[PDB]
Amino acid sequence: MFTNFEQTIVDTTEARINLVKAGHGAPLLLLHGYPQTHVMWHKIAPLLANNFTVVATDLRGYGDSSRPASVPHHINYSKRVMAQDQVEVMSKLGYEQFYVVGHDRGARVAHRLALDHPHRVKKLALLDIAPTHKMYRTTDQEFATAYYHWFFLIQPDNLPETLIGANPEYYLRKCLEKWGKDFSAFHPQALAEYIRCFSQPAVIHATCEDYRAAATIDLEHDELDMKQKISCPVLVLWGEKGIIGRKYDVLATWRERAIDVSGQSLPCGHFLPEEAPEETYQAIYNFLTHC
C-alpha cells in the first residue's frame, strides 16, 4: 500500500500529525473517519497522486497521530481544533490553499475547516455524511438505532472506553460490518492497520472524545455561524446501499449549509473509497478537474 508515498510525522503547534504524501500538482488533503486511519485512502490516493499532490493524514486522536487526554467540554476534539491541526500541516508543507476531501469524521472536520478557513479551502468533497447539527437535531428512533454509537460513544465515566477496550478488534469489526455492504472491500493489510491503531487505549479514549465534542461543543460552534455558508464548490457523495440516502435528502441537507453543492450516490455502503474506489475516484477527479 501507498507504494512511492513518503511517510512523515509533522509537528504542529498542538499536535503531531502522521501522514503519507505523493504526487505533484495542486495540493489535496484527504481526511479519514472512524474507526480508521489514512490507510482507507489506499485504493484511490495513488490515482489521485497522478494529478494532485496528495496529503493523507491521521486526525488527532486517530492512527499514529498525537492523542491528548480529555479536557472539560471536549474542546481539544472540537472540529475547530481538529481542523486547525490540518491547516498547520498543509502550511508546513507549503500550501496556504488546497482542496479537501473528507470521509465520515474527516468530513465533519472538513466542514468546520472550510467555515473557519474559507480562504484556504478551494474545493470541498464530503463523503457519506449529513451535517452533524442536522443529524442530532433530527434524532428519532430510526436514527438513534442505525447510528446508536452517536449515543453510546458519548456516555460518561469511561463507559465506552471500558466496553470497547475489552475487545477493540471485535467492536471495530462490528462497526465495519454494520456500516459497509461489502466486507471484501477491506484489504487485509488495511484491516490490520485499523486494528493496530484502534486497539490502543489512548485512541479508544480520544475517538470517544471526538464523538463527545460532536454532541456538545461542535453544536455550539455550528449554531454560532449557522448563517455563514461554505463559499467554495462542494461535492457530496454517499453510499446508495446505506440508510443515509434512504432516510435523508443528502444534497438538500448540504444546500442549507453551502451555496454551491453538487453530488450523487454511489453503489455501495458507507466506506466509499474502499467499497467503490473507481467510482469514488472518477467523481472526485471530475469535481477537482472540471469546474
For the residues of the chain, what is the DSSP string, one character each?
--TTPEEEEEE-SS-EEEEEEE--SSEEEEE--TT--GGGGTTTHHHHTTTSEEEEEPPTTSTTS--PPP-GGGGGGSHHHHHHHHHHHHHHTT-SSEEEEEETHHHHHHHHHHHH-TTTEEEEEEES---HHHHHHT--HHHHHHTTHHHHTT-STTHHHHHHHT-HHHHHHHHHHHH-S-GGGS-HHHHHHHHHHHTSHHHHHHHHHHHHHHTTHHHHHHHTTTT--B-S-EEEEEETTSSHHHHS-HHHHHHTTBSSEEEEEESSSS-HHHHSHHHHHHHHHHHHH--
Nearest-CA neighbor of 32 among 98, 95, 86?
86
Nine cell digits for residue 192: 490490520
Q: Determine the residue type at 244.
A: I
Based on the residue annotation, tell me whether 218 is a catalytic residue of this protein.
Answer: no
Compute φ and ψ for 98, nearest 5 degrees. -170, 165
Region for 94 from its dihedrals, namely left if φ exceeds 0, alpha if ψ lies in -120 to 50, beta otherwise: left
User: Would the CA dihedral through 220, 117, 61, 188 be positive or negative?
Assistant: positive
Sheet holding 53-57, edge to edge: 6-11, 16-22, 53-57, 27-31, 98-103, 121-127, 234-239, 261-266
Tell which residue, 133, 213, 143, has the closest CA to residue 205: 213
CA angle 212, 218, 220 (to 5 degrees): 120
Solved using:
X-ray
Contacts of 80 (CB under 8 A, 6+ apart): 112, 116, 218, 221
Domain, as residue range, for 16: 1-291
Annotated active-site residue in 104, 210, 218, 222: 104
What φ, ψ does residue 281 adopt, rounded to 5°? -55, -50
Told to judge if 270 belongs to the known catalytic residues of this protein, a careful annotator would answer: yes
Per the CB < 8 A criterion, the answer to whether 82 and 11 are in contact is no
- Residue 49's Cβ-count burial label (10 Å; 0-12, 13-18, 19+) is buried
Among the options 74, 111, 149, 270, which is catalytic?
A: 270
The CATH number assigned to the domain holding 247 equals 3.40.50.1820
Q: How far is the C-alpha of 149 from the C-alpha of 159, rounded, in Å?
A: 12
Identity of the residue numbered 100: V
Instruction: Count structural domains, the chain.
Output: 1
